Design a protein around this ligand. Sequence first.
Ligand code: HEC
Ligand code: HEC
Ligand code: HEC
Ligand code: HEC
Ligand code: HEC
Ligand code: HEC
Ligand code: HEC
Ligand code: HEC
Ligand code: HEC
Ligand code: HEC
Ligand code: HEC
Ligand code: HEC
Ligand code: HEC
Ligand code: HEC
Ligand SMILES: [Ca+2]
Ligand SMILES: [Ca+2]
Lengths: 520, 520, 71, 75
Amino acid sequence: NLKPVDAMQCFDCHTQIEDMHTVGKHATVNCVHCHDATEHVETASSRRMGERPVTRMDLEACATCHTAQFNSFVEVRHESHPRLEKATPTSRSPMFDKLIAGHGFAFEHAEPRSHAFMLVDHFVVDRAYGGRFQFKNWQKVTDGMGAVRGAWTVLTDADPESSDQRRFLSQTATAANPVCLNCKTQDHILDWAYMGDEHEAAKWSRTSEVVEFARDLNHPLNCFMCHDPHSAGPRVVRDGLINAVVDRGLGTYPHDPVKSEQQGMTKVTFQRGREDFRAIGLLDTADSNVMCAQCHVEYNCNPGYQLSDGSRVGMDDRRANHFFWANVFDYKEAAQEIDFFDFRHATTGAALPKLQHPEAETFWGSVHERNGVACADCHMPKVQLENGKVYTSHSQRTPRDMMGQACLNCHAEWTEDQALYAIDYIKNYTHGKIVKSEYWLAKMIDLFPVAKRAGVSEDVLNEARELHYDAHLYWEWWTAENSVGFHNPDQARESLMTSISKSKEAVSLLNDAIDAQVAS
Amino acid sequence: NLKPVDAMQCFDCHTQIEDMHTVGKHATVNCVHCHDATEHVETASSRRMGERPVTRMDLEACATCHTAQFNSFVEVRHESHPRLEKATPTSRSPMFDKLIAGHGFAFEHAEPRSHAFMLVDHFVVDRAYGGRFQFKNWQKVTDGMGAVRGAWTVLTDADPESSDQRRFLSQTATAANPVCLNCKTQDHILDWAYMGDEHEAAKWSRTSEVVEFARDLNHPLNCFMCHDPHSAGPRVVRDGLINAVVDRGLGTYPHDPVKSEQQGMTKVTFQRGREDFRAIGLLDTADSNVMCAQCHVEYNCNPGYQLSDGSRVGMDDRRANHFFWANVFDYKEAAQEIDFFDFRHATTGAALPKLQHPEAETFWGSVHERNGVACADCHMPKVQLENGKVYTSHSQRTPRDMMGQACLNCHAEWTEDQALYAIDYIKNYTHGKIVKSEYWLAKMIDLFPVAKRAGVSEDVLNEARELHYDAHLYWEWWTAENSVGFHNPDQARESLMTSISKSKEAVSLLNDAIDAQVAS
Amino acid sequence: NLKPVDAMQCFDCHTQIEDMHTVGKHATVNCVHCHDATEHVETASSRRMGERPVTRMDLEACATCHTAQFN
Amino acid sequence: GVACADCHMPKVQLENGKVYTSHSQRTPRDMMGQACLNCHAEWTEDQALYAIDYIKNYTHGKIVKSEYWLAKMID
Ligand code: HEC
Ligand code: HEC
Ligand code: HEC
Ligand code: HEC
Ligand code: HEC
Ligand code: HEC
Ligand code: HEC
Ligand code: HEC
Ligand code: HEC
Ligand code: HEC
Ligand code: HEC
Ligand code: HEC
Ligand code: HEC
Ligand code: HEC
Ligand SMILES: [Ca+2]
Ligand SMILES: [Ca+2]
């Protein structure tokens, strides 16, 4: 059984913790619930850590007093089909292989599934670690509780004796790097300096051997990613988000200065040896839009190249951990502002961006966002009980599973079937335009080899490559974004029509240039 | 409250109405239910209208005394997925964009949904009005009753101050013209001369500004499209159908003279200033096959070109409002008979037809049609009540929703699952041949640029273009037709195999010609 | 099929019904829906019924225009 | 101001249609959405049924006891 420790002794050296813990709703929660600091207290000074205390990062540290929230979190939605590749005719991007050729995502890009699996899924996807990690067997894919207990309870490593990123199977890639893990776990929260910069107190950084880092990480989506463990108040911990919102002054709602002020973020920095080390962002309100934006954003978390001169941008560069914090129509400017692109298309040679799940940036300016609705209202609502103490569901999932609570309480004019019909109208329309955009991108891409072989000039090919960047951006945003337009239907429509327009311009340019070469 | 008017006063000048009203089952229904004619009666003469009476065209004019039929009509089938683009891998025509390139349908062609939405869907589809009209917001897509009350109660116009057809968004088209509206509404029944010819008494015609016309129209599928309001007897009002059946003498069942005589149509013409103005077709029997054929047919409702010389055929030409009234194997001859084609393929340059929803012509000669079965038996059956007055369901929808009434009463040997299995056998087989036909069409189409660039002769290209017409026709009939072969499975099979044969002939011709150029 | 009768003629002797029928939502509903009064009209005066007209009491007399309520 | 029809012949609720008054005069148990929960938004169907049953059960118990005592007197 746990035995409490004297917090006042800790507070002597930990003023920031005292100021947070004594005021919030964890003022009665003893440190022993999460820390084993006996040897630390014996050896520390006011400025030197001495022996390092043990800090629990397992979600069960919270389950003890918050079982309802933990159990709701760890539930597996079996209807969220697992390991479902998006580059298939029946999923989100039928022509993805042709369009993304040159990028690691060609090796595998599955639809998301329940949060419990995020860290294990990161480890086992074919694009990440060369197939090094696997579930212990194919049965273990069901085990959400086991994944939560720890990745290494359910996974195996093909070669514990080496730590290099390499292929273990032919059709894999080694795209993973340390930055990725910030959106899968925060087990490393005390071992990683802000932004993953090099730091004498950091075990891990952007430039670490990712296989070694991986082995040190266990738990998905720690509860403390959204809730300060000391004050119990709302927060974010993701460095890239704090950097966008606070350091770069863009605000929590870049398009709305007032809402940004009302629903803001305060950066709190913790030091090691009186040098800034790590930071958190305390939220003015329990604003799920910003909490979920720790991960459900478009980002850089990878090496790339400069738009200006084509030179390599490696993991050592700050740009390798970056939140663009820009909607689809501001993205090109945001990529220009850091002089960055992700890859060269394998067929066209165009410099292209790689877009990833920009739900937060897409939601900005939508009718729901403008009306004060937030992700949690649709994806983790309060639970309705005939007789019971209400709590917030932590099963982050489609509203289709809880339409009473997610939609119909605010849309009293609709039945469940009507609300579902409205969702489907948007998704069906948007998906149709995604497919049309892919058709036209594919048509353009297929002309590049024909044009090169016909002797079309590099000047013309480069004009087409410039169009490819835009045709790509204004399409891929929407295969990346998980709502199939629901989050911002008018924006999706405008963007996808722009993609098609750009591809059609490139097709005409290339066809005319090929025909002129042939005629000559 | 309504106050009756003296019908005998009207009958003094309206002999045709007297002859219909006094004999049928509306003999006791006073004119005030549908007409406000006070000032008209004061000012008319036997030959001049004077002040124009108001005529109600809203469906609620009938709902008052026929609520069951109205409510069944306006029901929305939420399982009929809305705004679902057909040019996607999971819908009816995976390769539609490549095959239809050059035609407006490339901008958008969705699956049908419930009848309540026909007029609003016509107004808002991306191919029709350049994106000028939209629902007031994305919520309104659910509102079938509102659509029925009137399109302009649920839609907005991007520019009320102009009336030209233009693009408001990039990836739209302006294919709509006045003829289209005849299959969406008959609000214009008193304002449109037969066939849309120019007429001094007609406000609207084939050559009208369609945006202005659109603004004057409100209600979908008026109840009086199938039921004469004066006699209550069965009829059609669609000019193009009357023209095919009566003027051109083709009959209600062109393949069956006897059934045509037993189940015929009598053209009744109404005059303005003692000049023929409009017409209806009174049916000998309540024959849903002919009622539904007002709209569920292949038609011209658009400009096009002549097969003979390639010249433009505009909206002013009668051929712009035409029912071919021909099955798939008689269609080419029917298009030749009016010297007409719809578009030139964007890649192949072939003159091609555009086929649209030919359910009526497909049903001819099928086993069910030959056995006296009609559309209503499967799509709007009598309602079965343990205790109640029977009425006819007006919810025109798939029999899957009412298999007891639609199929199993006539197929006592089957369970519901067996009947569904039989439908699926046909649809699955037919769809497979549609996909194969598209594969071969696509293969042929892709050879055209290769052949042109290799220097293949125009003579060879023109031979391939002639094959393209047939390959196209014998495929597109079946993506246009909504039953996926169920209405006439053997015909679908024969046609689709013909399509593949034609495409294979073209592929061989082009490949051999390319190879010969290369060899030279 | 029903053939309407001249309600104004009935009202020459039926002021009580006139005052109800002409004001309410059945003002357009002809008497033939519920009465067979041909021989009555031929034989009545304002003070003598003559032949008794038939009045329908069956619910189907209403179902004809109000099927939803009937069913 | 509630009347028999509110519980026993309510207006029909239609996603798309012309409203009319149900003439099926029957227990509200068959149409609880339209003939109780429309007024009692604080309740689920099961809660509303439970409240009916509490009353009927209590009342019936007193009917049975009343009959017991009447019968004892009669005898
Ligand atoms: C003699 C002063 C002193 C006392 C007493 C003390 N600490 Fe610390 N502690 C430090 C210093 C110094 C650091 C390094 C960070 C800093 O400079 O604030 C540290 C770091 C930590 C960390 C971060 C460890 C890591 O992995 O980065 C935790 C957790 C912690 N202390 C918990 C506690 C707890 C719980 C108590 C009471 C049981 C306690 N400390 C008492 C001085 C103290
Ligand atoms: C020893 C029991 C205990 C432990 C362990 C514990 N909590 Fe709490 N927590 C509480 C109590 C007590 C409250 C206050 C309840 C109230 O008054 O509403 C609370 C409140 C909260 C609140 C609501 C705060 C607010 O201001 O509304 C959050 C969020 C929370 N805890 C999260 C967590 C997280 C995350 C963990 C794991 C890092 C955790 N708790 C661990 C007991 C515990
Ligand atoms: C009568 C025994 C038996 C039956 C029947 C059976 N399983 Fe298994 N299954 C096993 C055993 C034993 C293993 C291997 C256990 C281990 O090594 O951990 C296994 C392994 C598996 C695996 C892992 C496969 C792999 O390659 O790693 C899956 C998935 C699985 N079973 C699913 C199913 C499914 C689904 C069914 C029903 C279609 C089924 N099993 C029926 C006994 C059975
Ligand atoms: C800014 C936070 C963020 C970063 C950094 C991040 N991800 Fe993710 N990842 C997500 C979110 C959100 C999802 C779920 C939504 C989705 O997949 O579209 C996800 C899903 C996944 C999945 C499951 C779906 C799939 O694509 O197969 C895998 C595997 C994955 N990430 C791997 C990685 C890898 C490898 C990296 C680093 C190269 C990485 N992630 C970096 C946020 C992030
Ligand atoms: C992605 C951010 C996020 C994560 C991670 C998270 N929560 Fe929450 N949590 C929320 C939100 C949002 C609320 C509701 C705040 C509101 O509306 O006031 C909430 C509320 C709570 C509350 C307050 C009582 C309630 O139910 O409303 C507790 C306790 C809590 N969470 C515990 C946990 C536990 C334990 C975990 C880990 C199993 C967890 N949270 C993980 C977002 C998160
Ligand atoms: C007004 C309600 C609403 C809001 C607010 C909302 N979403 Fe969604 N979201 C939806 C709907 C509807 C879908 C489509 C779900 C479906 O079709 O099953 C969706 C889909 C998703 C999906 C994919 C779910 C799946 O299983 O396919 C993710 C991830 C997501 N949203 C994240 C977010 C984020 C993060 C936010 C806050 C920035 C957000 N959503 C805000 C309604 C909402
Ligand atoms: C707590 C409020 C709230 C919630 C939760 C909510 N809605 Fe809404 N929704 C609104 C409001 C307010 C509007 C805008 C109303 C208006 O302007 O007419 C709106 C707009 C919409 C629109 C129109 C969008 C557009 O771009 O025109 C759709 C569709 C919709 N909601 C569906 C849903 C669905 C489905 C859900 C459940 C996933 C949901 N809403 C949840 C309040 C809500
Ligand atoms: C003095 C003769 C006269 C009388 C009486 C008369 N009409 Fe007409 N009405 C006409 C003429 C003439 C036209 C033009 C068409 C025609 O020539 O038949 C016309 C046209 C109409 C139209 C078509 C209007 C349009 O928009 O095209 C309607 C409806 C109509 N009458 C209804 C009635 C009704 C109902 C009454 C009795 C209340 C009535 N009329 C009495 C002469 C008459
Ligand atoms: C004032 C009430 C009233 C109005 C308004 C009305 N009807 Fe009727 N309708 C009747 C009556 C009464 C009958 C005869 C019922 C019977 O005897 O079977 C009838 C019969 C019919 C029939 C059956 C005819 C047959 O020969 O079998 C049809 C079809 C019909 N109406 C359609 C309509 C249409 C369409 C409208 C709107 C243009 C309409 N009705 C408006 C009262 C009305
Ligand atoms: C001969 C009658 C007829 C004509 C004329 C007609 N349609 Fe249709 N329309 C139909 C039928 C029947 C359907 C439903 C069956 C289907 O879509 O296959 C339909 C469906 C539609 C739809 C919904 C499905 C889709 O394609 O997205 C739209 C939009 C539409 N029509 C627009 C038009 C336009 C624009 C015109 C004129 C260029 C037109 N229609 C002319 C009969 C017609
Ligand atoms: C597409 C043609 C069509 C349309 C439009 C149409 N009906 Fe019908 N209607 C039919 C058919 C078919 C029958 C059954 C005839 C038969 O089998 O005798 C029917 C029968 C009827 C009947 C006779 C009683 C019955 O139910 O059998 C009435 C009354 C009627 N319809 C009213 C209406 C009303 C009111 C509307 C507008 C809401 C409407 N109809 C629209 C085709 C149509
Ligand atoms: C013997 C029964 C039968 C007859 C008669 C019939 N159909 Fe069909 N129809 C079907 C079946 C079965 C389907 C496929 C429905 C499905 O798979 O859900 C279908 C599909 C349709 C569809 C598409 C429905 C949808 O939701 O996909 C339309 C439109 C249609 N038929 C119109 C007609 C027309 C118009 C007629 C008269 C010329 C007609 N049908 C006659 C059985 C019939
Ligand atoms: C506030 C709603 C309400 C009102 C108003 C109401 N009732 Fe009831 N009535 C009920 C309930 C509840 C029952 C018990 C039904 C059950 O248990 O299934 C009932 C039972 C009945 C029953 C027996 C039903 C059966 O199937 O056992 C009759 C008869 C009845 N009521 C008549 C009337 C009359 C007549 C009025 C108007 C003077 C009236 N009720 C007003 C709620 C109502
Ligand atoms: C026991 C009395 C009673 C009887 C008998 C009765 N109704 Fe009603 N009726 C009502 C009530 C109560 C209303 C609703 C009045 C209101 O709330 O405004 C109603 C309304 C109506 C309405 C108006 C439209 C509507 O639905 O609200 C019509 C039409 C009607 N009844 C027809 C009939 C028919 C036909 C019959 C015979 C089958 C019938 N009624 C028998 C009580 C009755
Ligand atoms: Ca990116
Ligand atoms: Ca056509």
